[PDB]
Ligand binder design. Structure first.
Ligand code: 3IR
Lengths: 409, 552
DNA sequence: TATCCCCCCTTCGGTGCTTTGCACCGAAGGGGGG
């Protein structure tokens, strides 16, 4: 189609981001891929007069041997003037959460047939560094729509609707929603027919314009309310920690009362002394346990805000997370467990947890969350590429204060 | 000559070229016409535009640089910010340790290549310069550049682009010939015989002459050693240029900074360099003319560095057929050294890590910071993360990463028994100790008065409150924990009402910037079993409410 | 009273929040080599 002019928001300039060092194999794969792309004309070499640069990384998606290019667009997406609101990215199916199976397809290759607006070509510049700084970085520039840019699906919307109209015509038993380069296809039918039907959808897309596969089950997802311990004999330390946990929960649930529980701790006993609960204490404990078991009331999604995701390390390969727009109005509390083969790699576990959380958040709300990783920035930036597989990247902030929380365990 | 293409350059939108007159100069330092200017006009590097280019720039002659060679250093400090921005594409500097075993090596130098690379036509007017003739008593004539100025903002990027464009066909036609091109140097090496290699060098020279760039034999270095960016290349050896440390009996802070800088520059091959004592003098310090006294520690450190540097040391070139191994040692006070090598006793590179990340940190965390640095340096210089040989025990590392609240990783390492070995001094308790003494510690301080109280109460009944002066609530909490630790036996259960203190002691530090924390760590390492617990404040929980009233 | 690059180091107001101190960090300058 014709190139839609793209301009930045007033008063702020294009991206200027340095390139993080890459390994020998990643650099070689990047050079070969970019040479092939330039031979096909999809990219053009550029000189020094362009003051823009975005980082580029090389990844290898699961169940494959070929390398895949990945260019960090975070800055350019944050700078681009509203190709998510003024363009068709607004509608999200509220029924996507309620599906037995959600499949993820790759449709990023279709974007390489639509040229980009010439006034915007200068902004999508990237550099390929060299080992030991032996040669200046081989700069390039995109001749077509770039993978990972938020305005790229906005431009390709008019063609994707036309391509997918027949499929929705014969088969209106599937809800379809794409986020950037990926297509989330979800059907409420039996899993055996679900896989065979995607092959037909893949066949329909193939001939009109790949053999991988993903599977999600959004129905089997539940919020995780906090639970108080259930013990018959209570020690002084155990009662104090329970009162602390209830004080933590009090900021979230207004119905919790700890007056009698605080009355029980009235003098100085040794931490290991056993205190038998009274009748009023048991009654208050039962009421508070029912309040905690009851799902949180008053949580509503607001599109005017942004999603913030917390991550805590619970030990022994187990992690928890919380998605919220306000610190005391959590929208989804969950838990992640170490998968087989990754029990001895914290960076790998956190990197896979980040992808799982962001995929779930996309499927549920259609807006990737702002992560708050419990890791050092330097080691994260060093090792997060070796384990990443998604073609999208969220915006994350780092925290160095200990969480101290057993509230989520 | 060849018509090497120019690069389009413009100013920043909405702002025009500068007009800066020249500061008063000296007749000895200047001339009626700066004699190089007319020769360069004849050569074609400068032309004359008088009436319709009402722009100017500061021009002076340098006496300090290049041994009073009187370089024409035209200053563009204003036009640099007045012009558009550029993206420099080269980030760092090549390291010989990343070089390979090449049988024949030749270093080519391109003299005044900047003045040989043409400049854009439109931007030529903005580089106008005029000079007074005699004692600033005559106006002189206004000239304008025709080629790349020396020291202009876009000059390095433009020259690198032009030179890589020139070198691209030759590199494409010969893949065995390796050609390092950094700024104004040209390292060319190969695995060919010496005669054929020199023949290829002559073809390279004739190619550049066809492109208008000349490599004079005055700077063309024929035989080894080849001085490269301050290093001494040999057939199977590399070494930094010989270093002359300041042997001055007196020591100013400026001389101390020179010493530490030259020691850092020598640290990449010489092992064992330490500068912590020489930088503790730099912190705070004084006026640069103040004769700074040297501590006994500082002078012992300088003597040790001198005895290290009095012998020559050398590195070795990379061999891609082998693996990279790096061993880390501990030097105390937060200093670490590593010796990246491939075969034993022949190390590719050496270095040090001595940064202090955070007010409260310990040996395990700092070793993780050291490995994570070495990793990124090895990536930059080789493209491969090396195999580590750490002193930390596998059990200790497992415990730390399994029980720490962050995500930490170390790529692949084997434990090496080289003291002082990194080990965790003390551990806290997960469950309260049976038959231990319980302390309720609390400290309340008013910031408007800069006073306060610190103490504790105990289940056995002993009580204590000490007045405080010029301290904050945090301090009072740390002091309360300190008293609880001091007055108790080898096993103690402490109840605290301060998440700040609870997090600091829970982080398990070994060294800290606070004498309070250092004393607490000493008490904890002396102790045998210690437990900490946190209760809410003003919650009426046992004797915590009473001790709060006492210390308020 | 030359430009630009990597690097080391200490000093700084600026935000998190862990509160109004404290921990933490990125932006400068002071050196080393280009
Ligand atoms: O030309 C060069 N030759 C050399 N080889 C070895 C030692 S000095 C230096 C790299 C040049 C430079 C100097 C100052 C400012 C900008 C650029």
């Amino acid at each position: 189609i014709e190139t839609v002019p793209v301009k930045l928001k007033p008063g702020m300039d294009g991206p200027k981001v340095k390139q993080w060092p890459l390994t020998e194999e990643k650099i070689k794969a990047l050079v070969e891929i970019c040479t092939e792309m330039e031979k096909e004309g999809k990219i053009s070499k550029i000189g020094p007069e362009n003051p823009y640069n975005t980082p580029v990384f090389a990844i290898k998606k699961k169940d494959s041997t070929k390398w895949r290019k990945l260019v960090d667009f975070r800055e350019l997406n944050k700078r681009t003037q509203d190709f998510w609101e003024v363009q068709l990215g607004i509608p999200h199916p509220a029924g996507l959460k309620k599906k037995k199976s959600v499949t993820v397809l790759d449709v990023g290759d279709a974007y390489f047939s639509v040229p980009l607006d010439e006034d915007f070509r200068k902004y999508t510049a990237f550099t390929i560094p060299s080992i030991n700084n032996e040669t200046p970085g081989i700069r390039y520039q995109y001749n077509v729509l770039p993978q990972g840019w938020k305005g790229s699906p906005a431009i390709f919307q008019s063609s994707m609707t036309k391509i997918l109209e027949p499929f929705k015509k014969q088969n209106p038993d599937i809800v379809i929603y794409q986020y950037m380069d990926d297509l989330y296809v979800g059907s409420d039918l039996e899993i055996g027919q679900h896989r065979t039907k995607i092959e037909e959808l893949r066949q329909h897309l193939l001939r009109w314009g790949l053999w991988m596969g993903y599977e999600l089950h959004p129905d089997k997802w539940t919020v995780q309310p906090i639970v108080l311990p259930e013990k018959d004999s209570w020690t002084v330390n155990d009662i104090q920690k329970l009162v602390g946990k209830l004080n933590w929960a009090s900021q979230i649930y207004p119905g919790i009362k700890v007056r009698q529980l605080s009355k029980l701790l009235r003098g100085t006993k040794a931490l290991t002394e056993v205190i038998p609960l009274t009748e009023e204490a048991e009654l208050e404990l039962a009421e508070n346990r029912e309040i905690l078991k009851e799902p949180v009331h008053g949580v509503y999604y607001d599109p005017s805000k942004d999603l913030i995701a917390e991550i805590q390390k619970q030990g022994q390969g187990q992690w928890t997370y919380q998605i919220y727009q306000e610190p005391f109005k959590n929208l989804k509390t969950g838990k992640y467990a170490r998968m087989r083969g990754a029990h001895t790699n914290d960076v790998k576990q956190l990197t896979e947890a980040v992808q799982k959380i962001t995929t779930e958040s996309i499927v549920i709300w259609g807006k990737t969350p702002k992560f708050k990783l419990p890791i050092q920035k330097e080691t994260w930036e060093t090792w997060w590429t070796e384990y990443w597989q998604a073609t999208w990247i969220p915006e994350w902030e780092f925290v160095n204060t200990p969480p101290l929380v057993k509230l989520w365990y | 000559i060849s018509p090497i293409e120019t690069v389009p350059v413009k100013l920043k939108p909405g702002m025009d070229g500068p007009k800066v007159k020249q500061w008063p100069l000296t007749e000895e330092k200047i001339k009626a016409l700066v004699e190089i200017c007319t020769e360069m006009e004849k050569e074609g590097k400068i032309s004359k535009i008088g009436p319709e280019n009402p722009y100017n720039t500061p021009v002076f002659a340098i006496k300090k640089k290049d041994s009073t060679k009187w370089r024409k250093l035209v200053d563009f400090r204003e036009l640099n910010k007045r012009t558009q921005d550029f993206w420099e594409v080269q980030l760092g500097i090549p390291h010989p340790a990343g070089l390979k075993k090449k049988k024949s090596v030749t270093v080519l130098d391109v003299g005044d290549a900047y003045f040989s690379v043409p400049l854009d036509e439109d931007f030529r007017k903005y580089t106008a310069f005029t000079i007074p003739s005699i004692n600033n008593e005559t106006p002189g004539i206004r000239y304008q550049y025709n080629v790349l100025p020396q020291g202009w903002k876009g000059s390095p990027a433009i020259f690198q682009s032009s030179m890589t464009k020139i070198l691209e066909p030759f590199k494409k036609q010969n893949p065995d010939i390796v050609i390092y091109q950094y700024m104004d140097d040209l390292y060319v090496g190969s695995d060919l015989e010496i005669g054929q290699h020199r023949t290829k060098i002559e073809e390279l020279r004739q190619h550049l002459l066809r492109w208008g760039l000349t490599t004079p034999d005055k700077k063309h270095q024929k035989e080894p050693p080849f001085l490269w960016m301050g290093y001494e290349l040999h057939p199977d050896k590399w070494t930094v240029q010989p270093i002359v440390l300041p042997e001055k009996d007196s020591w100013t802070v400026n001389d101390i900074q020179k010493l530490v800088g030259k020691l850092n520059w020598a640290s990449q091959i010489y092992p064992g360099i330490k500068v912590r004592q020489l930088s503790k003098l730099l912190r705070g310090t004084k006026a640069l003319t103040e004769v700074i006294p040297l501590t006994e520690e500082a002078e012992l450190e300088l003597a040790e560095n001198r005895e290290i540097l009095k012998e020559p040391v050398h590195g070795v070139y990379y061999d891609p057929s082998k693996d990279l191994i790096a061993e880390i040692q501990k030097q105390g006070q937060g200093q670490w050294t590593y010796q990246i090598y491939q075969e034993p006793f022949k190390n590719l590179k050496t270095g040090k890590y001595a940064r202090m990340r955070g007010a409260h940190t310990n040996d395990v965390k700092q070793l993780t910071e050291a490995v994570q640095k070495i990793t990124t340096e090895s990536i930059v210089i080789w493209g491969k993360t090396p195999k580590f040989k750490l002193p930390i025990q596998k059990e200790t590392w497992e415990t730390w990463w399994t029980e720490y609240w962050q995500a930490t990783w170390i790529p692949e390492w084997e434990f090496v028994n080289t003291p002082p070995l990194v080990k965790l001094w003390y551990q806290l308790e997960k469950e309260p100790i049976v038959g231990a003494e319980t302390f309720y510690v609390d400290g309340a301080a008013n910031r408007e008065t800069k006073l306060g109280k610190a103490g504790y109460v105990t289940n056995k009944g002993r009580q204590k409150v000490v007045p405080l002066t010029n301290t904050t609530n945090q301090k009072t909490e740390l002091q309360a924990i300190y008293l609880a630790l001091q007055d108790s036996g080898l096993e103690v259960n402490i109840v605290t009402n301060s998440q700040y203190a609870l997090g600091i002691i829970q982080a398990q530090p070994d060294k800290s910037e606070s004498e309070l924390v250092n004393q607490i760590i000493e008490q904890l390492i002396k102790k045998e079993k210690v437990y900490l617990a946190w209760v809410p404040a003003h919650k009426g929980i046992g004797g915590n409410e009473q001790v709060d009233k006492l210390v308020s």
